[model samples]
Target: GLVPRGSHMSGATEACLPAGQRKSGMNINFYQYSLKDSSTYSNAAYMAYGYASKTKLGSVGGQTDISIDYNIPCVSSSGTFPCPQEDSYGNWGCKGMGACSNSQGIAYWSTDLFGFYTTPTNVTLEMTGYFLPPQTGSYTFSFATVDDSAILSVGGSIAFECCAQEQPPITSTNFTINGIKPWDGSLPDNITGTVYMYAGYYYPLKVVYSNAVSWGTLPISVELPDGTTVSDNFEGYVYSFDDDLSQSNCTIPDPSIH
Candidate 1:
């Protein structure tokens, strides 16, 4: 059971609640799946498992507490966009990936994949949560993964899809994969999409990513209406309804009904 903390605010329109009164980051649920082959990995194929499927290895518990500011360049000892390596037992471990290293303070999942059985190749990760935008306006959300693909959907709308085997209907005019004008099936280092949102509203957020062969990275950030880009240390900038202590007042819509 989640404990209700912080002082409850009435009619608070802004996301900047007092320091301790602010809710924590988003509640993230991770689903891991096995792939028959490295080449068989794709956003569509992995998503076929579905969020409620029993075919997955299991649900990995965690939160999106870490940050990967896209504004900073990634450099590592292994190479510029290094991926994790897998042991014989299928445990994925970061080797020289600067983006996955702790020294840079931008490690994914706190440098751990939720203690589940994972591999460097032929693996898929599905992250689902609810996002609370700080302000109401048009915001640009961006994502980038290494070695394979990623797809992002907000409030049941497809916002961004990158490096996928099959392309879905493009809905956002601001969509871009790795700075390209139009997606060309090339693996992307980053992708961006724009959506209009309202403050104090809970929007469903889902990110599906797959890793083929080797190398994996997940970097996500948002360009606020004020032109400031933030990816890490959410604090007051963003909040998750899952972490809210008081749910009696929050009216998060059911994703299944819509």
Candidate 2:
């Protein structure tokens, strides 16, 4: 039974499991479908896998390889406007908190669903993670959200995602995912995999399947030189996700503005 207060999602379990004593939590491994071909991986696609502490690729011994691709979403309106670049990219051309390591490298920024705008929605790039079931096994899958969109587990289990829906962030809206009733948290080994990030006309693009003890906001919008908000975005009234791990930062009282 999964311990409610004893969540140990990460920590080299699969890697350091005792040879014959390790019970397969889920037969579905993230990569390596052919067993002979395990070097390929997508860091951005990993936004799926529902909830995880950390994930590693490669087969045993030779299973120590890692693959990373640029999954940043960069958009262009007539190629004149670039959005929300990476925090380190400075000013070369970036969108959102997304960034490419070099000319063509993957961008990595991690956060949860309660956050809007923190999702790496650059326009040109986006990413997801894939997994292949090792054997005929069952599993549980989850996803995240912000403003609008759907998350699908497309493939074996078919957790479909990113349906087009739009509405300003509100308390009535909470991140949701679709799957079987009483989702069995068991993963069948050797299942084909890949999670996708689809974005349009919304804030915050990235979301993860997480029930983090603490919740929070992405980031505040920036201001333009004219004092107007960038992207025509105005910090409207909304409550932030509850955070228990740190000092409160997202909380701001809703104005009684009538």
Candidate 3:
């Protein structure tokens, strides 16, 4: 006969959140392309949809796992206009022919992923992640940018779009998924919209910003149901596993695909 002994457990037991419940940070992708003339959201959309040749300058992390806050100020002297200059050795570089001190510059070369380069005119910044609500209620989202255009979506619904110019409309069929209308150039800046969300739930979020010819900045804010306002980097609240759209549960189509 053997005596049974009680097992003793020490320390605190930590439970891991499920795969869908884990919170890392927002995944951001930055792309650069040569604009035919000026910067427009349509061109950004086209670049995203593979209609134009584009270069993926980089991402938040080399693996695309970094968390970035929403408040991105315009970077000065990031690039200069009339870029892609030829050197004495016939090597083309970003060195421009004119002064490189103004906001009206174009970045023809690759830029640092962490630094938002205003020098590059034809640049598009796309961010994807899940917006985790702290409490359940209606939230109001406000968006503002210094130059060019921007669009924001939550749970696959277009929440805010600004500064659309009266240019050629986007003809991509994938644009239909997000219900993006033709650009009439009438979309106003500092736009706001409301949406009902649940606490502890991850809602698919996407933000696109395009800078055509100069300075650029994107400032986004959210008004929680409790009257508290959160802006810039949501930090711990914004989460993403990867840059892909596999985590999205809504109908918002991925503009990066054909």
Candidate 4:
């Protein structure tokens, strides 16, 4: 059958901590995207940040999540970005160029049923969580996304991102749906990167996902210095947070600017 997951999930722990094992809460938004593209890429730039002390944000102590938020100006739209599946060329319908409106609470990192009804088309999913490092060293990470469209950030740096660029290899086999009908992409294969940390350090994580269709994996895999790896089906992302701060203290991107 399918090879045991571990062999293929090389270089990291493989699985997310079950329900009770985690304590952090998640806020997810299903938003629309602008179809317009620029010469380089009118990419959607998103930066995820984790604050040790919510009150300390914007200060030297905020310890922003390391990531890349390239500057790009995209036109705004009113309605949701339509599902690419509706169009043979994967172009979203009217009301393009937009921002997310609906908000929902989720218990896990997986987006299998995000829209609640057949994974609605023409929208993007944004997931954010804060976590502490297990050790002091550089951690290499990657992500799995369906529709081959996703952007990920770890410790304020780009771990792997795709889809927002001007002209991506949209028709490439890697971005195509395979037999039995599943849309998963390596685009160029799993997006990979290295992030440094201290054992007691905490970092904010952010992931943006979109699909020509819907449903996808945001599983994170990390390889340690000792050559040992831990891959979380998301089970390993045990939510870490500081209770002293309120949700208002959290630094989220301004919706009006998107």
Cα RMSDs, all models = 12.8, 21.3, 15.0, 16.9
lDDT of 4 by residue, 1-258 (tens): 444333232332211111222344333444443232111111233211211111211111122222211111221255433222223121322224444332211111222333222232233444544545666566776653333255555432232112111111112222111111122412444357665544543355545554332323344456776678666434444343333222342332221111
Output the lDDT of residue 220, model 2.
19
TM-score of 1: 0.52
Candidate number of the best lDDT = 3
**Tens-digit lDDT track for model 1 on 1-258?**
254332234222112111123344443334343443433343343343332242354444335543321211134456545332342111222444423322222323322444444452444555544466777677887864444555666652332221121223234322222332123456545468776666755554555655533335567778898899877454554333323333343342321111
Clash number by candidate, in order: 1, 54, 7, 31
Backbone clashes, candidate 3: 7
Ranking by lDDT: 3, 1, 4, 2
Instruction: Give the per-residue lDDT of model 3 (tens digit) for 83-143.
Output: 3213211222233332333332434433433565433446666676666677867788776
lDDT of 2 by residue, 71-112 (tens): 333333333222332333543335443433333233323221
Highest TM-score against the true fold, candidate: 3
Cα-based TM-score, every candidate: 0.52, 0.17, 0.56, 0.42
The true-structure Cα RMSD of candidate 3 reads 15.0
RMSD of 1: 12.8
What's the distance in Å from true for residue 167, model 4? Answer: 31
Please report the TM-score between candidate 4 and the true structure. Answer: 0.42
Q: Rate the local accuracy (lDDT) of all candidates.
A: 0.43, 0.22, 0.46, 0.34
